[model samples]
Target: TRDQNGTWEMESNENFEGYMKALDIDFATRKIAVRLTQTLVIDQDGDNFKVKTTSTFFNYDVDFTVGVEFDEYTKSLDNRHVKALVTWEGDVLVCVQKGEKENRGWKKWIEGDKLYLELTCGDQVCRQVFKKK
Candidate 1:
């Protein structure tokens, strides 16, 4: 189980602008989020899943479980608050955040030696590929 438990660092983020704006992110944070290729680490356990990211602006550890809706404040990414749920559909970890937009979600799944994350908001979806050290 721990094989899929290591840190996954972000490689690239596509269409970073549209997705953040759809979520109504704060002023400059929105720009920074849209500009950078972020480094992130996501971990899972018995219940809740945790995500920590190192953005040029800030960082955090977000912990939540499947089937549980909670307040998801994207501090570093956008500083937008959303009602969200992180779940496992098949072999992927997916989070649906609804506040500023519906279908605001992200899914992470393993493909060979790569860990990929697809983030969405409004209709724009960005895939973040991880390149671990």
Candidate 2:
């Protein structure tokens, strides 16, 4: 999805998984996320699509597309709910999760050789890098 200024658009898949493990996900959750297929849909208007991540035992839905604000329920991570906003910072997709935790959220970027993801919650921060499949 491109921003309103059309300066950024979703690129092809590159690196992933590093950020997931940094979140300290259990072996089970990691296995599920690694094996599960993630679907990202972006509308032509670049404002709406259901980002769905499904696994054998769990499923996550982020219904807002872009430039829209919504609540994020980190059910699998901590069951801590937060109001979040995802916006474009140049070509990177940046999310700020507002709740009880300090410096909580994630950022995703696709560089020439890899995909970079940064996850933050409370005082812990994790970085994950992925290469194209």
Candidate 3:
């Protein structure tokens, strides 16, 4: 069994409002969407990590390793082939995804027993905070 494990539920996303508006999201849907929460399940194994991000409507799963470079097609999130890489940056488990889009990467880190997830893309970042659960 892997020792690295955690379930992080979204506490807040700073950039959701602008993102939804950019998508031309309708009135009621956008209003209700802001309250939606997504949970991230992290399974860290030897040189590898399995992740599951989910909510009521959408679900996404990705697995990768340290120093390993792979082509990742972000299906639901973005239909783009990202040359993804994972590595350690001090105490943080960092992900640097290189793609055609600008600022197309994300990172995960723990701070004071809390988990942090942030998605960076299209000149936007939706950083979410999570409390230990």
Candidate 4:
């Protein structure tokens, strides 16, 4: 099992702009989002989790339980409402979002001292790497 219930700081973000563009985000907002430092603070109590994503531009907080579907309104990111479900597959934590967009989801996993996140929207995928803080 991977230990992902800790604070992680972003080391690199790849194609985040493209992912945002796929969501029809404006250029001004995308420019600022691409340049901000993101830190992820995660807490897990059994199957329940609280994930807080902090940045200078904005902060996003989400609470979800594994295997339970909930309505997730992503105001800070895309301002869209979607049904979100979080599940554990071995050592990886996977999230699936169902809404107007197709193939929208994210995966979080810890490898050694680093955390990996891959965000998907449409045909675009944004990869983010984080180091344990």
Question: Count of backbone clashes for each model?
Answer: 0, 6, 0, 0
Error of 1 at 45 (Å): 1.8
* Global Cα lDDT for candidate 3: 0.73
Tens digits of per-residue lDDT for model 2 on 57-94? 66565666566778878776767788888888788888
lDDT of each: 0.73, 0.58, 0.73, 0.90
Candidates ranked by TM-score, best first?
4, 3, 1, 2
Clashes of 3: 0
- Candidate 2 lDDT score relative to the true structure: 0.58
**How does residue 19 of candidate 1 score in lDDT?**
71
Cα-based TM-score, every candidate: 0.80, 0.59, 0.80, 0.95
**Shift in Å, residue 132, candidate 4:** 0.6
Ranking by lDDT: 4, 1, 3, 2
lDDT of 3 by residue, 97-125 (tens): 78677666777788776787666666777
For residues 82-126, what per-residue lDDT tens digits would candidate 1 score against the true structure? 888777777877778878677888887788778887888877887
**lDDT over C-alpha atoms for residue 83 of model 3:** 93
Worst 10 residues of 4 by lDDT: 1-10
Q: What is the lDDT of residue 19 in candidate 4?
A: 88
lDDT of 4 by residue, 1-133 (tens): 5568999999999999988998878889998898577999999898889889999878888889899999988776788999999888998999999999998999989888999999999999999999989
Return the clash pairs for model 1, or none. Answer: none
> Candidate 1: where is the Cα deviation over 4 Å?
1-3, 74-81
